[PDB]
Design a protein around this nucleic acid. Sequence first.
RNA 1: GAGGACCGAACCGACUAAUGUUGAAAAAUUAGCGGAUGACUUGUGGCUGGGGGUGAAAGGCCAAUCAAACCGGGAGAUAGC
RNA 2: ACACAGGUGGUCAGGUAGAGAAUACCAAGGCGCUUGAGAGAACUCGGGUGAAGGAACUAGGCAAAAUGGUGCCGUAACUUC
RNA 3: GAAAUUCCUUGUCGGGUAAGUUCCGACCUGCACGAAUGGCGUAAUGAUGGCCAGGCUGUCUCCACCCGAGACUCAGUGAAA
RNA 4: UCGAUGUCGGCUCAUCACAUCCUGGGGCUGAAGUAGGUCCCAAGGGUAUGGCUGUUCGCCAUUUAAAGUGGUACGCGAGCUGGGUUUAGAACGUCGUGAGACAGUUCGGUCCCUAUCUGCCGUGGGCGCUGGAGAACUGAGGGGGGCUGCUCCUAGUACGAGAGGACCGGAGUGGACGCAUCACUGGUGUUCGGGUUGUCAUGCCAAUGGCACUGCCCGGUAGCUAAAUGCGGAAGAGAUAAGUGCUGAAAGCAUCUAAGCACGAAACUUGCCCCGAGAUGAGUUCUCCCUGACUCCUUGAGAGUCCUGAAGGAACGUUGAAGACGACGACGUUGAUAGGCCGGGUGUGUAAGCGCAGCGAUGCGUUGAGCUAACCGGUACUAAUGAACCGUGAGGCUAAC
Lengths: 120, 113, 122, 55, 209
Amino acid sequence: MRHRKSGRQLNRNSSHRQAMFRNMAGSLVRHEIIKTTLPKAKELRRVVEPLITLAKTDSVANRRLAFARTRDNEIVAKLFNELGPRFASRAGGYTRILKCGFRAGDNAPMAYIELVDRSE
Amino acid sequence: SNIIKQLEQEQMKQDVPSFRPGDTVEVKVWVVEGSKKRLQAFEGVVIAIRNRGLHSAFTVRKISNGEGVERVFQTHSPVVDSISVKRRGAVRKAKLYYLRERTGKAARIKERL
Amino acid sequence: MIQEQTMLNVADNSGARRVMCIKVLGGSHRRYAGVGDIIKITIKEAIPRGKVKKGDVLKAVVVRTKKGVRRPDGSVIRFDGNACVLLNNNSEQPIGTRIFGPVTRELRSEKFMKIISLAPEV
Amino acid sequence: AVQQNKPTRSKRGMRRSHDALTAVTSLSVDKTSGEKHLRHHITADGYYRGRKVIA
Amino acid sequence: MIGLVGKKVGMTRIFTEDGVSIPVTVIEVEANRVTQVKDLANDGYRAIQVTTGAKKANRVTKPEAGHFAKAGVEAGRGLWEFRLAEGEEFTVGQSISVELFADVKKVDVTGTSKGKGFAGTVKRWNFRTQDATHGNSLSHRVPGSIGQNQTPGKVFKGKKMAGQMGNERVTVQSLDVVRVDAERNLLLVKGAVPGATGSDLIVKPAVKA
RNA sequence: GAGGACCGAACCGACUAAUGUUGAAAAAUUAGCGGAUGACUUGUGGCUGGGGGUGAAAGGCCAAUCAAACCGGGAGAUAGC
RNA sequence: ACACAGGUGGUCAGGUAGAGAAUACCAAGGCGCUUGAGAGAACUCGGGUGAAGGAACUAGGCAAAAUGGUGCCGUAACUUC
RNA sequence: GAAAUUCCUUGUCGGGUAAGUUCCGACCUGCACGAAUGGCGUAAUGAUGGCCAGGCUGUCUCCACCCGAGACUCAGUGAAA
RNA sequence: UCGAUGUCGGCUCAUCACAUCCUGGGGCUGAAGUAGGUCCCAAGGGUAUGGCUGUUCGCCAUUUAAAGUGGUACGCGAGCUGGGUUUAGAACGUCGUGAGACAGUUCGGUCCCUAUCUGCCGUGGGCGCUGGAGAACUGAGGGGGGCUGCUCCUAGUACGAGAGGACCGGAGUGGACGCAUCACUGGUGUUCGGGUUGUCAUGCCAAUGGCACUGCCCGGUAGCUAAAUGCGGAAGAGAUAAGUGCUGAAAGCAUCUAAGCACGAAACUUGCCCCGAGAUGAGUUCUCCCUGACUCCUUGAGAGUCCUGAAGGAACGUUGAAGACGACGACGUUGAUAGGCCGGGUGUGUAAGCGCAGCGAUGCGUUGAGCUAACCGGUACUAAUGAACCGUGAGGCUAAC
């Protein structure tokens, strides 16, 4: 059984699962809206949202923490210099998920996930 | 779950000293033989602390008469009369289970300054 | 948690070094022995001039166990190895005259009061 | 591990009593564009619950 | 004797000064409110139907929003019934406290056990595992034989096979009532009762006693 | 500086186990395993032809076929089954 | 027979560890193995870890665990030395 | 010499084990050993047969949990006896 | 049965019989007690681990209340094994001139099947149950359970010569087994923290990340879980078995039986738990819900339009200590359903950066710091959208009023 457990395995080993969310957290910071599956979203929420909580306090000891969980220095700058101040007065819920239908190739339920401001 | 918390925190003691793993404590326990409540000592090294509020326990390990004796005392229990730190050990770990394999000058713990 | 084939140390001066449990007594299909329980043992290593010799088939009471005991408090007393006091088959009294190492007070039963009044600790 | 007798037209269609797909009959109109869409899904043009989300 | 309906808060322990830790299951028994008494005449048997807890106003449906308004009590999370012994007689709208269990000393607790899902014959029925090695081919936690040969020619009704385990009503009997707290509405019983945390427990006095 | 020496990769094999058994594969995979300067191993040609060859010998092998290969013929052998 | 987990001669052979063409991680270079998405039941493969016991398993220590390197000290019966 | 050979046979005695139809040592009463279809030994060697011991362990008592691949649901294709 | 029904043993899982091994009840005894011997009643539950051998068996070593006997294709290979027997190799003894042979040994020696139907274990869909709906029940029937030691009191009494040593009745503790549960004690914990080896990378130092079985390790949250802790095997009834009776004739005597009335077992029926109204014999109770027009015709049987869509349900979404999928449960902004966030807990164990000491490895201070999963408490920050959809319009044909 599975009582009170969290984390979707997503038919991956734990190293592929960790590397897939390191990429996908990088992509949600780049373009601020990505189209992913509906279960890879809602698992990205547990990854990208502590990154924006981390970036709300800019310090050296958190810039390297964010670098360790996001091995991309361009993401760490946008997290701290853009997404940190932008979500200063928001208590969680930095991302929303908009279900967009079904994938053509495998009928997978797709969704957009995006930062709730997006600054337009 | 404030209900179990208020049921737990009415039974905890207010007399638990702040020991760490590696400290050498001596724990006086009440023993009843048939009707004589006696207070006997167990003096070894703390090798493990479980912090759980009311369900807090700590393991004390001594070498008694050539034998290794471990003793997992439940603190906040009315059978443990007092806990008393006799020296402070300086370890970098929270569980000193490797001292079951070391015995002697191998199991010497550097005193904490 | 002493079962059949368990090698136990010998917590008395009766001669043996190692004994092996060859039956847990006191009920059919019984699996383990605690620190108050009697076991049928065979002697696997003795000292050359002791009371007993290698190959005797007799009884013993487990007194120290790596599994350990459970007090009413929920607290545990474990030991580093397993030990037993060698007993006569017929009148289950200790063969030895000394008891080496501690025991626990799960032995106060007035069949082992010549073990509690012999052991150094408890 | 293999049949002893060929099953019939009867039992073949009796098994497919539950193979019948269920239609939706629950399309939802959008309150700013009038597009029908799946419930809790964005529209084909990217409106959702009156807001333009995707474009 | 009537029961009460409660909720499994969890497990903790009590320390007597004797040295024993008594493991308890904390059961929150709030004020069970009688919604319907029953009689031998109209209904065939004597019972009371109580309710407990508080259900929100927009989830209680109209066929039960009227059944509660007939009694005058509030809503509840459910309705449960208790067979009355032939001396005791209750009134509709009477609230029964955990003060009932002052002098009981031993209770039977009913609850729906934790669901193990589809379990196998080893977990469900304590079947013994076959050899992990020594030549065994794909048959370790499989059950083995389910029958005989041709002369029965069938498996017997009631065979122990794999299936749904747990998620079932289970009564544990004769649990020692440690203490009754009439102000926090608590019943501490010695040992563990079926169900997870938050499940609805039904605590009657002991019939075996 | 010898060795049908030793350890151990390539290489050549095939002892054990599990998988596989309508297989990924008409003999394999995976983890171990033996030999590894030699009675080794391998390429490219050649030569031996069926009651014949070749065989450190198993009735082994001779084109997924072997106590007498395959193909065509006698031939629609014969068949008290 | 297959876009087949097999077979297939020779040549070239970088770095850091290492005795090494072992192995680990990399370069040059080449790829991600032509169904995916979920879910996280039994059971089955392939692994990981276990209290106490330690061969009680079993036809049999089968399988697994364990041992494993270099230097130095030290090493028995027997021996065709 | 009760052996890769001994039917009776688990002969008998000794050893090993709490207990040993196997093992080792013998005895000789060799059903039905025996001297190049070699007899008795024999260091070394063996993926050889049997037995014991120490280590070691999920082999087991008695299994628990975890990690991946299927199983399972959805979409596409689509067998077999 | 030769157009194939796979043998012995082991394992796993059983199931029945009773000619009963233990426990329960009796009669007799060459039954003082304690131990027995024997027969009768009784099948509810229980009914060893090992050494040897392929073994069943057997013999041994220790247990045990006891280690029952039989049937079930000598139960059980579309469940496992493959040691034995019984393929092809080889050898010994033996027999044959020989090829070879031996219920003689001896080493070696491929165990396939994706389950259609029955059966079984679970789990749904449909329809029915007659207006629909939401509940709670009743309980006809099923099922589960149903074992027992040892100590202590009775009492060293009854008995006996002494030795020894009870019945009945209680009290406590175990063993095996079951059910439940994680509070404890632990296991696990590849989603937590840290140590560390090799190497690549982030320009480099310092920090980190990848890969090496989670690289190897040391710890460890929740969950799951046993070895861990709770509980349970009743008591009571009712009918009886064997058995003992009371009254009592046939047979002026007797006589347990023929009339009658008593006792009497773990069996039987209940009592304990669970399932259960598809119990089509489809029950009961409470509550809720809809009381509009017309038109068409063979016509007491309806059909078709417009109107109105109720209670409720489903679907959808957020989900769950529920779960293969369905189902089940919670929730859906009149909102704590999930994620986040905040605080705390927990676990690791003194982050980084800086400063100081030292030649440096590194130590020390900041500092029990920093990180911290599934936990707890909160908090609408994100997502749970108005709809729409299904289901209708008072319900067929004695008593009372």
